[PDB]
């Protein structure tokens, strides 16, 4: 039998996610000490971002940007920093350079979205802006999602040196010279990395919850689960799967009774 209508059951939350407190921050951080904010228990509107024409880069990797308002997410993050305009191409799975080697490394099996826009109006003084730093020398590469803050003289292969620059005793960091008469590609861009894990779920977008329809071959969506079955009443008790590695029970997320799933 063909499915009759659609069923949508999301929890009754009404708070919205703090994307204003991430995107519209007054001052970001430098890339060697990049900021982080864990987002949970809200309703996320990814329709007010891809419709904005301000963002000059909106990549997504494990998901398309149109199909973001339909999935429920686990472990959302946000990573804010300021880089130079010709290094946004390094913020990607598997790149090389000086940002994807000593500063900020993304894993290979990455599921998320990279957003980056231009902020020359806010990050360029008259004499110059010399306090956005990046790491230039390190002994070895980084593991994925590894932070490293240290102001110590990078001893190369010579006689050691103790808080003193000298012969092969370089400084570790380096400041970008953001003055506003730079060409594009030397201007301060400004990057946010949204990373999330798919498939306990908390964050998902504004879909309206329908009512409950029993003993009919319907299409259902219980907080993330798609399928086609017949909903009945259960006996004893989320995600309720059996020996066939398939879901055949589900707790209703708005009233705590247990439902079954019988295939049509």
């Amino acid at each position, epitope marked *: 039998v063909q499915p009759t209508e659609s069923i949508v059951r999301f929890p009754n939350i009404t708070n919205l996610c703090p994307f204003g407190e991430v995107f519209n921050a007054t001052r970001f951080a430098s890339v060697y000490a990049w900021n982080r904010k864990r987002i949970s228990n809200c309703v996320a509107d990814y329709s007010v971002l891809y419709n904005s024409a301000s963002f000059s880069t909106f990549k997504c990797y494990g998901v398309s940007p149109t199909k973001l308002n339909d999935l429920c997410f686990t472990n959302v993050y946000a990573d804010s920093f300021v880089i130079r305009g010709d290094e946004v191409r390094q913020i990607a799975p598997g790149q090389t350079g000086k940002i994807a080697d000593y500063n900020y490394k993304l894993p290979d099996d990455f599921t998320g979205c990279v957003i980056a826009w231009n902020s020359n109006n806010l990050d360029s003084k008259v004499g110059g802006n010399y306090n956005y730093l990046y790491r230039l020398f390190r002994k070895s590469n980084l593991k994925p999602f590894e932070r490293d803050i240290s102001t110590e003289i990078y001893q190369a292969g010579s006689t050691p040196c103790n808080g003193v620059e000298g012969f092969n005793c370089y400084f570790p960091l380096q*400041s970008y010279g953001f003055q506003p008469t730079n060409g594009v590609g030397y201007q301060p861009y400004r990057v946010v990395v949204l990373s999330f894990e798919l498939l306990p779920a908390t964050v998902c977008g504004p879909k309206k919850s329908t009512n409950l329809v029993k003993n009919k071959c319907v299409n259902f969506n219980f907080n993330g689960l798609t399928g086609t079955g017949v909903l009945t009443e259960s006996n004893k008790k989320q995600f309720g799967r059996d020996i066939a590695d398939t879901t055949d029970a589900v707790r209703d997320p708005q009233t705590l009774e247990i439902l079954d799933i019988t295939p049509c």
Partner: antibody
Amino acid sequence: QLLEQSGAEVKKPGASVKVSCKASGDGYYMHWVRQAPGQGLEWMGWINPNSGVTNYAQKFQGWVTMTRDTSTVYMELNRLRSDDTAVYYCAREETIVGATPPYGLDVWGQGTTVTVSS
Amino acid sequence: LTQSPATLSLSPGERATLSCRASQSVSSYLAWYQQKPGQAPRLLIYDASNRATGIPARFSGSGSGTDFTLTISSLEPEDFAVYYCQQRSNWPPVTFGQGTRLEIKR
């Protein structure tokens, strides 16, 4: 800022001499640069005022020793010779914690004349 | 460091142009200083093009790579002194230059 010097003083060959540089202006180094008469400038060393970590030039390893307290910074030179007659300047340097500082030595003291004669 | 020429002669109203010559890399910031006889020196330019506070609009340096210039547009009678270039790096941490003297012609 405002930096003050000790004053002119005359010594003997083989004696010691100690120069001060007060700083009445509350993350910056202190440099010491010397100028022999009718000559160019010449760097001696820097001292961090808080942690007291110092770096000296290659030419002055063994003859110069810079101290501090808490500001007022002291530079002391021993084993004087006929080639240590100069004027001594102290110079402030704004710093960035971690990288090389792009600002130059903007505030200079007025100078301390040291005469070494027999 | 190596400046050229050794002495330079102009008249009030001319356009001064003098050059330094720095070393290895791009982490090698450079500045310009002015000294009158019997004074202490004075910052003019830092990072080869950025004027310090209080310096008028006629002092303006440029240059990149291993060649740096300072250029004065209109020469005043109060701008006759000795000029220095000063690098900032790791292995020699300062290394001042040698000096270029500026003077009046009649």
